[PDB]
Structure formats: C-alpha cells, structure tokens
Amino acid sequence: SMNPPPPETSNPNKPKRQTNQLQYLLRVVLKTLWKHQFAWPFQQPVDAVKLNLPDYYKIIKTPMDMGTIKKRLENNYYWNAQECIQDFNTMFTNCYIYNKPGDDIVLMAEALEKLFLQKINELPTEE
Numbered sequence: 001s002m003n004p005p006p007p008e009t010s011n012p013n014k015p016k017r018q019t020n021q022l023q024y025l026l027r028v029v030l031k032t033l034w035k036h037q038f039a040w041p042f043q044q045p046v047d048a049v050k051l052n053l054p055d056y057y058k059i060i061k062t063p064m065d066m067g068t069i070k071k072r073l074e075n076n077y078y079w080n081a082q083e084c085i086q087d088f089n090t091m092f093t094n095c096y097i098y099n100k101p102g103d104d105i106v107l108m109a110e111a112l113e114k115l116f117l118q119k120i121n122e123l124p125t126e127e
C-alpha cells in the first residue's frame with residue numbers, strides 16, 4: 001500500500017504575499033485549532049498505510065491537513081486569505097466525505113470547524 005506525495009508547501013513560481021489576513025489565519029485561526037484536544041488527527045497527512053485505509057486516497061483526491069496549512073502559512077505560500085480558507089474547508093470536507101456521521105473523527109472535525117467559523121467571522125479587514 002502507498003501514500004501519495006503530500007501537498008506542496010513551497011513553489012517558487014507561485015506568486016505570494018504577506019497580508020494582515022494571512023497573519024491572522026496563522027496567529028489566531030491555525031493556532032486556535034492546533035492546540036485543541038481534537039487537533040491531533042489533523043496535524044499531518046493521513047497515513048493510509050499505517051491506518052490500513054487502502055481506499056482513502058481512492059475517495060479523497062484533494063487531501064489536506066493542518067500540518068500542510070501551517071507550513072504554507074509559515075512559508076508564505078499563499079496569495080490571499082481565500083486560498084488558505086479553502087484549504088481548511090477542504091480538510092473538513094474530506095473528513096465528512098470519507099467517514100460516517102457519528103464517527104468520532106467527524107465529531108472532532110465538527111468541533112474544529114465550529115472554532116474555525118467563529119474565528120474567520122472576525123477576519124480583519126484587508127489592509
């Protein structure tokens with residue numbers, strides 16, 4: 001069994017900028033979710049080999065995790081906040097696609113997503 005290569009966190013050909021919204025996403029949003037008790041399944045890519053999930057990457061074609069997001073934010077990978085928000089929503093969506101309602105992992109994603117939504121509600125004005 002085989003995992004795919006993880007999502008890229010560096011791309012010198014990709015335009016990039018530092019914005020106050022992106023710093024908020026690192027310093028407030030990512031920090032809030034990273035320290036949560038339910039964060040650990042989401043801090044790195046899903047290892048479908050060790051987890052014995054050979055169908056994971058057959059179903060999930062856009063994997064995403066907070067470890068990748070953290071490195072992308074720290075490496076200034078993004079152009080705008082929307083790109084980073086999309087990555088967060090992709091990671092939650094993957095969890096809901098692959099798992100059953102009521103699975104513990106879904107309850108964990110749900111709790112993180114609630115905090116995510118509470119924090120992005122106060123995303124500062126782009127300035």
Ligand SMILES: Cc1[nH]c(-c2cccc(N)c2)c2c1C(=O)CCCC2
Nearest residue numbers: 041042044045046047051095098105
């Ligand atoms: C998001 C997610 N994370 C992890 C996991 C579990 C233990 C260790 C590591 N690194 C990752 C899983 C998962 C799923 O969606 C499928 C359900 C269980 C596996």
